[PDB]
Amino acid sequence: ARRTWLGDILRPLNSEYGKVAPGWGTTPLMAVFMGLFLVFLLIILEIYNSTLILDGVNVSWKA
Amino acid sequence: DWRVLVVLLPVLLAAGWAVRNILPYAVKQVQKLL
Amino acid sequence: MEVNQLGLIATALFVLVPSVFLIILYVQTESQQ
Amino acid sequence: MEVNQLGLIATALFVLVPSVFLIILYVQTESQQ
Amino acid sequence: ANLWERFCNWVTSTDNRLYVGWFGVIMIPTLLAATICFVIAFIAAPPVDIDGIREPVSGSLLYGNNIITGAVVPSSNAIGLHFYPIWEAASLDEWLYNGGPYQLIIFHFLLGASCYMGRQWELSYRLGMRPWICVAYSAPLASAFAVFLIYPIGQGSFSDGMPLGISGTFNFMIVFQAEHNILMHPFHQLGVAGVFGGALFCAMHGSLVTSSLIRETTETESANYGYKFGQEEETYNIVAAHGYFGRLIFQYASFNNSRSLHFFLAAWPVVGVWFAALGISTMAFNLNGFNFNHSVIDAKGNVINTWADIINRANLGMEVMHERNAHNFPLDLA
Amino acid sequence: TTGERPFSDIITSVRYWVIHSITIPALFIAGWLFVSTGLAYDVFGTPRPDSYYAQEQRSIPLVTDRFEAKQQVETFLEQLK
Amino acid sequence: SYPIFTVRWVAVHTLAVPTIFFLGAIAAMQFIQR
Amino acid sequence: METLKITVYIVVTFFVLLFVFGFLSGDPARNPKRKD
Amino acid sequence: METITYVFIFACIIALFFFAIFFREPPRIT
Amino acid sequence: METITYVFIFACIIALFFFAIFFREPPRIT
Amino acid sequence: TITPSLKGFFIGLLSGAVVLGLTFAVLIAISQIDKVQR
Amino acid sequence: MEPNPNRQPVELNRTSLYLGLLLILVLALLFSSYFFN
Amino acid sequence: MEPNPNRQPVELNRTSLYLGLLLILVLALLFSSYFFN
Amino acid sequence: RGWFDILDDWLKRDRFVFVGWSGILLFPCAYLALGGWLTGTTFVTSWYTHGLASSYLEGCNFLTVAVSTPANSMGHSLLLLWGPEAQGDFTRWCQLGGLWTFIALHGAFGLIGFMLRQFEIARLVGVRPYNAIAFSAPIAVFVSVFLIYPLGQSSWFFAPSFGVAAIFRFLLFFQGFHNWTLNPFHMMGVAGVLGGALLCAIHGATVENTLFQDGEGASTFRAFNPTQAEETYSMVTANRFWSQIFGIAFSNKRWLHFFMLFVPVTGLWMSAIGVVGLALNLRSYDFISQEIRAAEDPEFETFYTKNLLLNEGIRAWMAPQDQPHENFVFPEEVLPRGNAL
Amino acid sequence: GGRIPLWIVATVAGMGVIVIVGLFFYGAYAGLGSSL
Ligand code: CLA
Ligand code: CLA
Ligand code: CLA
Ligand SMILES: CCCCCCCCCCCCCCCC(=O)OC[C@H](COP(=O)(O)OC[C@@H](O)CO)OC(=O)CCCCCCCCCCCCCCC
Ligand SMILES: CC1=C(/C=C/C(C)=C/C=C/C(C)=C/C=C/C=C(C)/C=C/C=C(C)/C=C/C2=C(C)CCCC2(C)C)C(C)(C)CCC1
Ligand SMILES: CC1=C(/C=C/C(C)=C/C=C/C(C)=C/C=C/C=C(C)/C=C/C=C(C)/C=C/C2=C(C)CCCC2(C)C)C(C)(C)CCC1
Ligand SMILES: CCCCCCCCCCCCO[C@@H]1O[C@H](CO)[C@@H](O[C@H]2O[C@H](CO)[C@@H](O)[C@H](O)[C@H]2O)[C@H](O)[C@H]1O
Ligand SMILES: CCCCCCCCCCCCO[C@@H]1O[C@H](CO)[C@@H](O[C@H]2O[C@H](CO)[C@@H](O)[C@H](O)[C@H]2O)[C@H](O)[C@H]1O
Ligand SMILES: CCCCCCCCCCCCO[C@@H]1O[C@H](CO)[C@@H](O[C@H]2O[C@H](CO)[C@@H](O)[C@H](O)[C@H]2O)[C@H](O)[C@H]1O
Ligand code: OEX
Ligand SMILES: [Cl-]
Ligand SMILES: [Fe+2]
Ligand SMILES: [Mg+2]
């Protein structure tokens, strides 16, 4: 296949195909961030929904 | 409120009746399970 | 009747464009070995 | 401008009809053995 | 062989590309008559005085309609159940004004579609098949008889038959609900179960068979080339499909007999559509859907509205507005 | 064939019917009493037939205010007296 | 030799228990007057 | 109108008679199995 | 134009019926 | 519509130039 | 400040954590007791 | 330059032609009224 | 029934495609003003 | 052998009701949506949200009970039990229509749980996932009708209420307000549903009537064995039959069964797209050209024009009681009526 | 295991369903929801 100048520069970034961390790896950390993201999305959903009403947050054009 | 007991009267009294007619065999199931 | 001025071209292309697509694929299939 | 109401469809078909005819014949030629 | 024996062998020949048969000798002229007249009427028929009130309704394309609004309008209310063929009219222009084409189309159609059912029996007999495809077809056939013939008979006029068009169909449906509360009739409800269930079961059976197709092809080709027409082997693993669907629900909920499964696929929409047809055909005699208007009364006697009461308001709105110039007396009796 | 006892073996056994000739009526009777003591009305807030309207009221107690709907219902209920 | 309490037993009684209770409630409703 | 009435009556009678006589013409024996 | 358009599309459908019936790919037993 | 039509046909011609030049059938010496 | 709907939000967050938490403790526990025979 | 080995022949059988044309013409017949409006 | 021996394959090479398309587009560009008028 | 793998072992055990990981989502959500519906229709009123009786406890029957939508004044509030509207009071939550959102939200997550179950079981037994793919259509219908439609509208009030007659009101509302029968997306839906029931009827009947004689009984169900390799019915005879009756016939069993997936699934997807339009009132209400003509020519009448008058009757006669938040007083002289009736 | 015949169980349970639905049909004509 054709070597090019830019291709030889970018070569290390396409060199670890199929490479993995053993076992569960960082899965428990990922799950925690997913849990926090779910809570974050619930919070902003409930603010837009007026289910969560906070001081200083008038969800309206008049704000 | 006296009416929660009356509704829970036949529920409680028949749960206790079925846990008596099944207790010699609910024991045997959980024992071999251990 | 006072119809949409683009209704004729919209209908004609809605027919003709995918119909010719299918005809192209049919005809070149028949010509394969 | 106040143009002929059929000029768009007349032009669109004058393009599309023989163009697709040529495309059909081209594509089925390429697919021959 | 004489000419009659040769003709009979042609008529009943299984080698004809389309099977004629004895039902076919009725079906073919009748259906061609109904089709030709329908196509000409739908394109070009002048407006028809459907309600008998000198208020002609425009149904054809040339008279301002599109595909959606166009229809062959039912014959005039002044005609009622009277037979109105071309020869009974003083001219074609009068026949057209009074809705002659409708009677011609539906009569040829119903005769023709009845013979389509007979023709399905006939060919199955000639081919050595079991004979009951025609029984399945009797469901939509009965439905067509219900809306084109039985409903007009019980109501006393072919003007109450369903129009031959798309918006005309919707008008028929809305007025029917106004006058009969068809949604609250259990036969219609069984019809719905027949058709939703039928579409459900169609999706289910299609999906389970497709899911269990046995690999005979690669990724670059349609899996449909894995089946050869008239191959002896089964093309899907029915044990795998049963093993899936009996774990999706539970084991005894799932068919493992393909013959039972296919009978169920026949029987469910067919029995449901039979109930739908009987629904229409019994509302033809004004035995209506359930009336719960003011069924719920408080301790004083105040009416407490339910959802059925909200349906009644909608029903009233269609009723007071339908055929808005045809009624002269307070009760809509037929 | 998943190892559970067959249902037709269970419901034809006498031990099942010793148990269920007590538990099935007791549940049915417990449901009967939930209505006939009137507890069903007080748990769910469903009006009794004499509590839809005040005595000369014709209007519906419809909820019109989102964040004070809980109070609108309570004011409607306190007008039933 | 079979067990008594299973995931199946639980699934049956999560439906059958409230069902019989609700059937008694609705039966009693047949004898409410206005 | 009278000529149209007679024409339809003739045509209809013709096809009805084909149907009736055709089903009378040993129809059960036209089957692939028992040609009795 | 409208009426012509609807009749045209309809007529093409009838023609397609003709080809789909009389010029189908013949089912071959293999 | 007119202006769009003229520019469209023109733009197709320019595209056809591109294919006729850069994606021609290559002249092969035989 | 903590508004009532915010405390209500924390109630629903805690109640979901308790439902999912007690479900997953029970599922883990039964799974540990009733292992598959390999 | 070597030719591309990922290339694949494309097919559409006659029944697929008839089905597709049926689909396109019926959608045309259905939507035409709405396009004219 | 035996197939018809008069049948012949039809061809249009790529240059013929490009020439024909050029022809059709230029005739379109030429006549479009007259069709709009 | 970690705790995950042992939990995976237990969840995927062969049992009478398969559980799975999807069953953690499916089984509570389905049970609550089902149980919420029965609870609401047995015991819960709609008196404060709609001014309706909607329970067996109030005298309704199976056709007329419903769990009705919340009041229009609630907007699109999630109406959580702990939310700012009910404030934790279960009795008030039932009175404000919180059971509607409870059923809708748990029904939604249960439907997800059910499609996840379809994937999980298909993956475990080793079949392709077309049943899950076909289930996308009822999900698309549920999401468009029960969620997207009211979200486009003013509130959850205008969603369908979960009841037989309540749904019938939803049908007649869509005629009178949206002219939904005129909508080409609904028409595609009707074709898929009716075409689906036709294929169901015809395929079942075709198989049953082209069966091979595989046994001596006149009742022919016993002649099937699931371990047979041979086709139980004659595709060749079925093909010849339908080619001669109808002109065309299936000749590929795989395409036949795919088409049976495709037809009702495509139809339901098409109707869902129409309902999304109706969320924004983007109706196919009228044909502009006919309205121009009917306005200027008082003799032009079609079935479409007649239907518009029916629709005007529906709106006027139903709106005061169907939308009690509006406080419509329509005096008798403003209601459209024809002569006599 | 096989004490009570399943046909007896089926018959009594089938008749229990009839009585309960028949009561609900009786309640359509009496009391609440009867329109009286
Ligand atoms: C299969 C052929 C066939 C049949 C059955 C029909 C049937 C009909 N035509 Mg059509 N028609 C046909 C072909 C046919 N047509 C053709 C080819 C044309 C073009 C020429 C037409 C043109 C046409 C027009 C223009 C009109 C009709 C009309 C009619 C209707 C009334 C006819 C009538 O009054 O006859 C009278 C009946 C007889 C003379 C019956 C004699 C039959 C035998 C001898 C007696 C047995 C009767 C008894 C019922 C037994 C039946 C057998 C049974 C046991 C199986 C009737 C539905 C009219 C209509 O549609 O009105 C709304 C009408 O205006 N037809
Ligand atoms: C798979 C099971 C499942 C799912 C997906 C749902 C989903 C839902 N339920 Mg249902 N519910 C369930 C089972 C389920 N439920 C069961 C078994 C019961 C009976 C006990 C209920 C009883 C119930 C009631 C009575 C109500 C609901 C409601 C709801 C809705 C809102 C829930 C919410 O906002 O909590 C938010 C919490 C979470 C989303 C938890 C997420 C986990 C996070 C990411 C982990 C971190 C949390 C953290 C540890 C908490 C610490 C807080 C601390 C800082 C103070 C939502 C649709 C409400 C509703 O329907 O409104 C109309 C409602 O009123 N549920
Ligand atoms: C020929 C007559 C006809 C036919 C065949 C249809 C067909 C359809 N209509 Mg239409 N309709 C018609 C006439 C017709 N309609 C007329 C004249 C009107 C008046 C304008 C309407 C008004 C109308 C409205 C308002 C709506 C429809 C909708 C639909 C679609 C419903 C799809 C569906 O299955 O929903 C059924 C629901 C689902 C598939 C969701 C999934 C259901 C879950 C999986 C069930 C779970 C059950 C659970 C396991 C157990 C439950 C407990 C049990 C006790 C019940 C379908 C295309 C709907 C639509 O377009 O939606 C996109 C819709 O909202 N129609
Ligand atoms: C023999 C099967 C014939 C195929 C039938 C095809 C049509 C099936 C019709 C529908 C069901 C008909 C009645 C049973 C058809 C029938 O043949 O039944 C027979 C079947 C088996 O009975 P036994 O358990 O005695 O038999 C066990 C056998 O193994 C004998 O050893 O009975 C049932 O399974 C009872 C069902 C109670 C169901 C328990 C419900 C628990 C809730 C589960 C719901 C959760 C799953 C939902 C997932 C989302
Ligand atoms: C909501 C809620 C909840 C839940 C609850 C539940 C879960 C419930 C359940 C419930 C249920 C679970 C119920 C049941 C019911 C049932 C019933 C009521 C039944 C009935 C039946 C009958 C009536 C029968 C009839 C019939 C049919 C259907 C068909 C065939 C024929 C016959 C006739 C047999 C909770 C607390 C968590 C939370 C809060 C809220
Ligand atoms: C099994 C089964 C079931 C069930 C069913 C049932 C529930 C039934 C019942 C049945 C019944 C329960 C029957 C009965 C019968 C009766 C009879 C048949 C009677 C008769 C009588 C008589 C005839 C009379 C006479 C007289 C007179 C007339 C006068 C006076 C004197 C005297 C009384 C003698 C089911 C479906 C679940 C499933 C399958 C199986
Ligand atoms: C709206 C405008 C649309 C206009 C449509 C124009 C349609 C034009 C039709 C062109 C038809 C070409 O017709 C097609 O010709 C090719 C060869 O050329 C034939 O193909 C045949 O020859 C080729 C080459 O020898 C073989 O590889 C092939 O196996 C064999 O079948 C097809 O069997 C025939 O179907
Ligand atoms: C206005 C709407 C117009 C839309 C136009 C749609 C254009 C569609 C383009 C279809 C192109 C098909 O593309 C064509 O595929 C065929 C096979 O399928 C290839 O053909 C190749 O395979 C076949 C079969 O193995 C061999 O016989 C042939 O010799 C070889 O070249 C052609 O080399 C390629 O050019
Ligand atoms: C509706 C008005 C007419 C009413 C008719 C009732 C009259 C009763 C007697 C009619 C006689 C029918 O008699 C029937 O005639 C036909 C044709 O002539 C005979 O002849 C037939 O022979 C064999 C079958 O047998 C066929 O393959 C052949 O094509 C046919 O000619 C039948 O074998 C005989 O059964
Ligand atoms: O045409 Mn047709 O719709 Ca049967 O009800 Mn009376 O008549 Mn008329 O008003 Mn209503
Ligand atoms: Cl009308
Ligand atoms: Fe099948
Ligand atoms: Mg009562």
Side-chain angles (χ1 to χ4, degrees), chain E residues 4 8-9 12 22-23 25-26 29 86-87 89 91 121-122 125-128, chain H residues 1 4-5 8-9 15-16 18-19 21-23 25 27-32:
Chain E
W4 178 248
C8 281
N9 287 331
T12 65
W22 300 114
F23 286 104
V25 318
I26 305 299
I86 302 197
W87 53 91
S91 68
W121 162 75
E122 194 178 338
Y125 187 62
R126 306 307 180 215
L127 298 181
Chain H
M1 293 297 197
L4 178 62
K5 174 175 186 180
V8 172
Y9 270 48
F15 283 108
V16 171
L18 283 187
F19 177 96
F21 281 85
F23 265 135
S25 297
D27 197 89
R30 301 172 196 277
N31 76 85

Side-chain angles (χ1 to χ4, degrees), chain C residues 4 11 22 26 28-29 32, chain L residues 10-12 14 20 28 35-36:
Chain C
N4 186 1
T11 301
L22 287 167
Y26 173 65
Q28 63 94 43
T29 306
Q32 294 172 27
Chain L
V10 181
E11 55 154 271
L12 185 90
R14 190 184 310 167
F35 296 166
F36 287 111

